Amino acid sequence: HHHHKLPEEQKVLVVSFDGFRWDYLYKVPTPHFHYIMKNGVHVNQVTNVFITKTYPNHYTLVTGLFAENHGIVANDMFDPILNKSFSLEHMDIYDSKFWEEATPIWITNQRAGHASGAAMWPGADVKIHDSFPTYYLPYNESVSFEDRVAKIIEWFTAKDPINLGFLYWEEPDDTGHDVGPDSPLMGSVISDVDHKLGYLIKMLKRAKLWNNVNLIVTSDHGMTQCSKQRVIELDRYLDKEHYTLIDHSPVAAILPKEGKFDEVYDALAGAHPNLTVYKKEEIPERWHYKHNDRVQPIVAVADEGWYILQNKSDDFLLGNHGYDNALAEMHPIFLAHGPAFRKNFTKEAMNSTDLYSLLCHLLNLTALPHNGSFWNVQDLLS
């Protein structure tokens, strides 16, 4: 018979499938994504932040800030005040000072008395302002999706449960790089990701969380097809001895050596039609990228689908991202299901800087100063 159920605090689980381009939903049958759509909300065009790389965009999701403000401007950075480098590829990400120009939402959540949990979310196993999420996993890409889900569900159902979870998975980004997003093999990995989403849905239902957790499924960026016929080779124009390459492609962050600034700029600007060379102060305002000492004196941006190689042996991948965030192929999926969200609703656009204000609203937190607007996304809510 129908009876009372104890009022639960509002809960949110944010899931990021890395590199899940907005239109991947249509490359193969995605019944579990479509199940969420039919019972939830879906935004066609999510404008993420420049540069359209993993660490800048995940930190935007948990701060509501543009990259010049939260300071995670790239996956590879050099901070001249710290005189230190940051590099994802070397797992050299744990220097707290690279993160401390902002405060991620899990800290704000916990300062309000709640508990947060993170299962491989970029930056969640880093000490920031002397704090971690209440529960987190040390980053390890080899941990299965099923084990990450198991931890999330354990934490949402613990003696002292979390109200806010973050779950992360490295596909379809990794395969998109390997084969290129135009490859028919992308169907296999997208289908697998849809199966993993179905596994998550099944476990949320089994744990009696499905109808009381607001599940948000999104990503950090998309992916575009590259080609060995679309390469810009810097050593055709520049003496490698006269600059340091802080980040390579498709946004080359260039630090000329002492006195070589005008040599480097003059040699590279207009050298190739698909490489736009900006002096820091000329960087487009719409990217909200330039007001930060981690933005190097010269930033050279390749057009969509072009690769910057410093020399003939530099890295090349059939898929890449990082390009202009106005480009549709850089845009991630966004869909959601839960008691706070409408059902079978589709909206054309959102800015990824708005998610932070949505999360703060759902959890009844006081948002720190940010660049998004709850009013832009209030129509997703029931």
Ligand X SMILES: *[C@@H]1O[C@H](CO[C@@H]2O[C@@H](C)[C@@H](O)[C@@H](O)[C@@H]2O)[C@@H](O)[C@H](O)[C@H]1NC(C)=O
Ligand Y SMILES: *[C@@H]1O[C@H](CO)[C@@H](O[C@@H]2O[C@H](CO)[C@@H](O)[C@H](O)[C@H]2NC(C)=O)[C@H](O)[C@H]1NC(C)=O
Ligand Z SMILES: *[C@@H]1O[C@H](CO)[C@@H](O[C@@H]2O[C@H](CO)[C@@H](O[C@@H]3O[C@H](CO[C@H]4O[C@H](CO)[C@@H](O)[C@H](O)[C@@H]4O)[C@@H](O)[C@H](O[C@H]4O[C@H](CO)[C@@H](O)[C@H](O)[C@@H]4O)[C@@H]3O)[C@H](O)[C@H]2NC(C)=O)[C@H](O)[C@H]1NC(C)=O
Ligand U SMILES: *[C@@H]1O[C@H](CO)[C@@H](O)[C@H](O)[C@H]1NC(C)=O
Out of 96, 227, 311, 364, the residue judged to bind ligand U by CB under 6 A = 311
| Residue 303 interacts with ligand Z (CB under 6 A): yes or no | yes
Residue nearer to ligand Y on the CB measure, 350 or 359: 350
Out of 7, 81, 142, 348, the residue judged to bind ligand U by CB under 6 A = 142
Q: What is the CA radius of gyration of the chain?
A: 21
| Residue 315 interacts with Zn ion (CB under 5 A): yes or no | no
Catalytically active residues, by annotation: 54
Minimal distance in Å, beta carbon 272 to ligand Z?
8
Distance CA 204, CA 11 (A): 13
User: Per the structure block, which two tokens stand in for 16?
Assistant: 């990021």
User: Per the structure block, which two tokens stand in for 134?
Assistant: 């209440």
> What residues from 337 to 356 belong to the interface with ligand Y (CB under 6 A)?
349-351, 354
Candidates 114-122, 139-147, 340-348, 354-362; binding stretch for ligand U (CB under 6 A)? 139-147
> What residues from 319 to 348 belong to the interface with Zn ion (CB under 5 A)?
none
Residue nearer to ligand Z on the CB measure, 162 or 232: 232
How many residues bind ligand Z (CB under 6 A)? The answer is 5
| Residue 81 interacts with ligand X (CB under 6 A): yes or no | no
Distance CA 355, CA 279 (A): 31
Binding residue per annotation — 272?
A: no
Binding residue per annotation — 125?
A: no
Distance CA 1, CA 3 (A): 6
Binding residue per annotation — 220?
A: yes
| Residue 44 interacts with ligand Z (CB under 6 A): yes or no | no
From Zn ion, ligand U, ligand Y, none, which one binds at residue 140 (CB under 5 to 8 Å depending on kind)?
Answer: ligand U
Distance of alpha carbon 338 from the chain centroid: 22
How many other C-beta atoms can be found within 10 angstroms of the C-beta atom of residue 252? Answer: 24
Backbone angles phi, psi at 33, to 5 degrees: -60, -40
Binding residue per annotation — 239?
A: no
Backbone angles phi, psi at 159, to 5 degrees: -50, -40
| Residue 85 interacts with ligand X (CB under 6 A): yes or no | yes
Out of 23, 125, 174, 233, the residue judged to bind Zn ion by CB under 5 A = 174
Distance of alpha carbon 180 from the chain centroid: 19
Q: Which helix (H) or strand (E) holds 246?
A: strand 243-247
Task: Read off the DSSP letter of residue 138.
Answer: P
Binding residue per annotation — 262?
A: no
Distance CA 217, CA 169 (A): 11
Binding residue per annotation — 173?
A: yes
Burial of residue 9 (CB within 10 Å: 0-12, 13-18, 19+) is exposed
| Residue 229 interacts with ligand X (CB under 6 A): yes or no | no
User: Per the structure block, which two tokens stand in for 284?
Assistant: 């487009």
Binding residues for ligand Z (CB under 6 A): 273-274, 303-305
Chain residues that interact with ligand X, rule: CB under 6 A: 83-85
Q: Residues comprising the binding site?
A: 18, 54, 173, 177, 220-221, 321
Annotated binding site for Zn(2+): 18, 54, 173, 177, 220-221, 321
